Amino acid sequence: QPNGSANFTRYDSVQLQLTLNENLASGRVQIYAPNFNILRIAAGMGGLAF
Amino acid sequence: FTEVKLIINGSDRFSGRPGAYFRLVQPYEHHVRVPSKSVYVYSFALEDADSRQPNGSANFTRYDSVQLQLTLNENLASGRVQIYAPNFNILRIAAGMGGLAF
Amino acid sequence: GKFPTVTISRNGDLAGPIWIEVNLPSLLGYNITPTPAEGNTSNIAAISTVFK
Amino acid sequence: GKFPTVTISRNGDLAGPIWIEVNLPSLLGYNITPTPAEGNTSNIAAISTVFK
Amino acid sequence: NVGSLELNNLSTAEDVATLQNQLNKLAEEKHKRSTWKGLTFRIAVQDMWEALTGIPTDIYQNSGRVSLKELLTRDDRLRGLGLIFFLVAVVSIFF
Amino acid sequence: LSQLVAYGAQDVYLTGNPQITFFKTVYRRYTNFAIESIQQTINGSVGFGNKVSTQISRNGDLITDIVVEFVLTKGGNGGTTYYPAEELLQDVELEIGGQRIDKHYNDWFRTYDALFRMNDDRYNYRRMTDWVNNELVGAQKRFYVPLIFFFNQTPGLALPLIALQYHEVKLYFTLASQVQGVNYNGSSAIAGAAQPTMSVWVDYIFLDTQERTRFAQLPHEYLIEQLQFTGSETATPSATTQASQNIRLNFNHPTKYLAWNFNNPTNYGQYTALANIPGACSGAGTAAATVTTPDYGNTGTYNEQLAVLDSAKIQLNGQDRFATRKGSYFNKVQPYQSIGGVTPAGVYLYSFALKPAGRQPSGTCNFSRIDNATLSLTYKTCSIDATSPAAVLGNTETVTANTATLLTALNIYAKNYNVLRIMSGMGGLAYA
Amino acid sequence: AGGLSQLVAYGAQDVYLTGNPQITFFKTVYRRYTNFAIESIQQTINGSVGFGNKVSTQISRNGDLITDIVVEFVLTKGGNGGTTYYPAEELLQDVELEIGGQRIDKHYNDWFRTYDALFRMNDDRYNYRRMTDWVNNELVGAQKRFYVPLIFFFNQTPGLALPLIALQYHEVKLYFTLASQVQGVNYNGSSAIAGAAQPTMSVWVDYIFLDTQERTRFAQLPHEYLIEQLQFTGSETATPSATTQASQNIRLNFNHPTKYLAWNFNNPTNYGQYTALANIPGACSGAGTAAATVTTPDYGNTGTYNEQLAVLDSAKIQLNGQDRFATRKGSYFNKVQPYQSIGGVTPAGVYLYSFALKPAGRQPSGTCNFSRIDNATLSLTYKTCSIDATSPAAVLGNTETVTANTATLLTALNIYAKNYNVLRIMSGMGGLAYAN
Amino acid sequence: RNPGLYMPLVALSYHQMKLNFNINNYLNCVKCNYPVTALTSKNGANPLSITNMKLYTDFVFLDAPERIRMSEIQHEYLVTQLQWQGSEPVTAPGDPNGSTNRKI
Amino acid sequence: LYQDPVWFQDLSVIFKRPSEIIPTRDQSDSERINAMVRLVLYCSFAVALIRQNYLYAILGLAIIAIISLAYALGAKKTKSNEAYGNIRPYSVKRSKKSCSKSSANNPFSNATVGALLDNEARPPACSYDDNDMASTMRKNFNKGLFRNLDDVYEVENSQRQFYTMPVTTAAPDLTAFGQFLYGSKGKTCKE
């Protein structure tokens, strides 16, 4: 059941500010963001939309 | 078990799967805990520990003949395979009188 | 390094849980190609009949 | 300790008298494991070929 | 030389019976002709039975939730309304 | 097929039955059709132990014969292989619309061969599935394993894909993880063994307009054959007793026949004991003979002395279906009077049908109405020292080789009749 | 209870098998039958019988219908056991049937061998060999009676027996051309055998006698018979020795609805050799010892079921330039089709492509209309013939795409087709309905 | 992971559901002590192939009334999927080529 | 699948249950005929009550018969009221949507090859519960098939495998699917 969401479709620009420690090596930060979509099934056909 | 396969009325109920499947995977999906002990299980229902709501069942009353084939490892001692099968019934109580209905 | 695909057959009504069953070989039997120093590998129990 | 079942087949029209035929073994060919103290049992004629 | 199959005889008959098919359908033809001849203009005294079948069953037809007009009147009931001829004759004798 | 049938005058009045002279054949005028063979695409990697499948493409109107072909290398010299292609094609499943119609096992193909094909036909089959010219290690050959499904057997039962517009038709193929003389030799792996190349070929029937149209639009039923398979462990004592064993059967349809064998799972096709007599061991007849290893090129034998079945009876609902027969009846007599071929030792048949080898129903046993069907076996005492021909070739009918006890698995087959039903672009079975 | 348990435990699944029975298996039905008698007699041979000679006969009107024809030969053997191969069959090189001066059927010795290779089996194939060869290890000087039954449409189908009585104005003749050479009899390879005897030949015809009314009907009524015919063509083979798998495209110059095509490749030197020779048991003269060669066959065993001595790699048939079916390996035409369509075993080097469901049947069951096809082609790919035939290691330890270097001697391709036509007989005369 | 969302394959006849699998490379998934460049079988020259990979889909089979309704009725499912992004947090590793304040 | 509310024609006894409708609007043709029947019955009965001659009711019944007979006989079979795609221009009034009813040759109306046979344009096989076609489907499936009488919820003869495919026309009607996922939203902000 959906319990709230941020509607990023209305966020033209989002910046995440990460203040890093001083002892890091050069790497990568992967960012994941699970979200909500509506699957609409009809007439033998699928596809994901809103 | 190296492989286990259930036969219902002469036919395979599922492709046989490795013992590890029944030992670890099945309870991950269908039970609260994984025994992490060599206990092998198989469900006829989706996601439970009774759960106070039936989620599927196999009506063995109409399985004229059932066999369970165990492909055994090569290093087992002679002994017992104790097979359990929790099932459903109806507690039937009326006018002070009890009994369990089939 | 491969990119195989799987088509889920319409041989049931609903696609429930999916598991990938992977049978991997024992790794100790494989050699370490550069041969770092002590050598690559030699099975002791199955072969090398010089041993009793 | 078992609970076997039987389905009575329609091998005739009426199911009449039912009998259970049981073949039980003799028990003097079996040991009492606590060990009563007097050597349990041994067949004299079949084994112990020291005897004539 | 060719196989032609008759599906039913107004009541689905599985391809098991062999002479029952002839007996049943001969009975069907006999019933159809009996109804036709007893349902045409030539009637002797059967008007009384038709009227006595008409009135209570015509009334009961509306005691169901619906009843199609093709069945409220045409189910061997149309001449069953022939008793109105009797009653109008009676009143014309009176009036 | 169950609707009442009658003819109009045009098929009675305007015709009649002509008298035919023995010597004047009048051939039947027939529909217009053509036969093609094309390759299907296999989904799934090919290799030992892998399971792959095909979806059969709608490239014709009806389907009949299907042949699986493989390319195998040989891992040893002549006498080392036994029907590698048959052993390789471990489990073949016929599926319509996701629904199982039939299922064959490598052991079934061998059992089937043992009972139903003969002479040159079984010889031809042998070289379709095996090496027969004493070839050498490193050799590479193509083998053909024909499928024996009800629709492969006859034009009359062709699958009308044209009538199955919305159903997938599939064949699943499990490949054996081990194939003798190719991937494994006895218990050892063969280093350097190549993976097989596999393809599946399907014939197609192209119908002309008039009956194509009928197949396309009309509902259909077919009598079909199905294989039912079950099995058990065996009781094979070496001494002091002849074991009896009650194996409950688990079958559910009008059955044309029952068949079974006593197998050693170690070696595909080994249905008999091994002995130090010619053809019954690797190296038989000399000092190097190993009584625990077969002559792989010759694992079958017609020497029933090495088989373990003394006698058997089949009960239906606890009632003996026939008086107790000896193992030789099931091995030699039953197939003689019913099929006419020769069945090797270790393979047994009991028929219900007059003609088990034919397609027309000719007597069946309906197990859907039998609650307690049992195969009751009596085993031979397995007390002969297999390394000594003096006893193996000269003892009584109730005793066999000590090596006979390695035949620990019982394979029981039944071939039944069902009805396949196609309606609205879809198929399925008349009965579960 | 026995049969009663099975009989009584009846269910729904049985209704489709036993409800409203239409047939009884324990009481059969006999078809209308007419009384027949058979007589076997000799025909006169017109011409001198000997090696390489051509003679002919004419069927005497000594019965109403003709059932079968058997040619008897007396041959002596010039070599020992192991030197001959179906010598009666080799000897009867070319047989032609003529009605009213028109050609109806034409067979070649190679066809007779091809036919046996594809359609006969088990004991009748063995019994055939017994009547055309020496099979009991007979020695030089041995003399035997050999028989070659003919395989023409009226010899194999009792129902096509010729209505000679409906042909009173036409003669029916048979030409019997004999080979100039027979292996192990007249020649050993290319070397003539001094003292070889000439063959003695007689032609036997099996006649049917009809009763009065059926005889009258055959003689007076018009008849049409569906018959089979053989068509034949051939050419040199593009067999590769190395570095390549040569292909060849041979035009299928055939012209009627065809039940099937069959073909083989052979060494013209040796009758029946459709495979490469090799130093493996049964594959050449002297196989297994120091004297072994791969230039001279084991004549008693020129046949084999070892396809690795066969030259063909793969084949396809095209019609009007279009593929008829996907290219298949040669073993498809040697093993699989015979399995699928005839039954029994086909010797290596012999190939079949059937259009018919039942090519072994008399009843037509699908045909290819070459009469309506302008460009029919058989496209053949050969195996590379790179294997040293004298080395069992190479001969027996090899792969699919290669064969013995001795396979390059298989220079002739023989293609056969069996088709239908219609034999029309009326008012005492007849011939075939369709031209080309 | 939810019966209520089990893909209704039955109602998707023109859109087969497929899985695309990026299997890692050979010289990965091993963490040994020495700087291996390749691993090879002692027996033969097999480059560490996977012995046997199979995919097992648990399918639900519905009774016919449900099948027909699932086939004919339109469906709206609320489902959860994910997006992700890469980044470059050099973080001034001594070298003056960045700082600790990285916006993404 | 497209659904419409329930109506019926003047036969049976419906002319009394939703009574007190006299003249037509936004109603089906059967409903419009029913409304005309109500008009004539009430008008003629009221006239007969006002002038007690007992014959105005007879004339009302006669003209009822005339109108009903005209509607029953004069109906034009040239209807192609099939809804699919983006446009349904043939009619905007209430009407029964066309259904391809189950048939003996095609028990489930799966349009395997029946579409190419005669229809060319085949109306969709409408819902499982619309017009009691479930009973007809079960009857057609159980034609010539014997049951073992051990299943009164018949699943033994493999009902489950057989079903109606999601699309029963020659084309998937992709426009309707797209409009389902992506609404037109009429006049949007960018316009």
UniProtKB/Swiss-Prot annotation, chain F:
Compartments it resides in: Virion
InterPro entries named in the record: Capsid_N, MCP_C, MCP_C_sf, VP_dsDNA_II
Primary localization class, coarse: virion
Induction line: Expressed in the late phase of the viral replicative cycle.
Gene Ontology MF terms in the entry: lipid binding; structural molecule activity
Keywords assigned: Capsid protein, Glycoprotein, Late protein, Lipid-binding, Virion
Keyword Transit peptide: no
Cellular-component GO terms for this entry: viral capsid
Modifications made to the protein after synthesis: Myristoylated at the C-terminus. Glycosylated; highly branched oligosaccharides. The pattern of glycosylation sites are unusual.
Glycosylation sites: 276, 298, 395, 402
Note: The viral capsid possesses up to five major capsid protein variants. They behave as asymmetric capsid components.
Protein task: Major capsid protein self-assembles to form an icosahedral capsid with a pseudo T=169 symmetry, about 190 nm in diameter, and consisting of 1680 major capsid proteins trimers. The capsid consists in 5040 copies of the major capsid protein (hexamers), 60 copies of the penton protein (pentamers) and 1800 minor capsid proteins of different types. The minor capsid proteins form a hexagonal network below the outer capsid shell, stabilizing the capsid by binding neighboring capsomers together.
Entry protein name: Major capsid protein
From Swiss-Prot, chain I:
Organism of derivation: Paramecium bursaria Chlorella virus 1
This protein's name: Minor capsid protein P9
Post-translational modification: Stabilized by 2 intramolecular disulfide bonds.
Gene this chain is encoded by: A407L
Keyword DNA damage among UniProt keywords: no
InterPro entries per the UniProt record, alphabetical: P9_TM
Residue intervals passing through the bilayer: 29-50, 55-75
Top-level taxonomy: Viruses, Varidnaviria, Bamfordvirae, Nucleocytoviricota, Megaviricetes
Domain remarks: The transmembrane regions anchor the protein in the membrane of the underlying inner membrane.
Function noted in UniProt: One of the minor capsid proteins that constitute a network internal to the major capsid proteins and outside the lipid membrane. The minor capsid proteins glue and stabilize the capsomers.
A Pfam family annotated for this UniProt entry: P9_TM
Subcellular location: Virion membrane
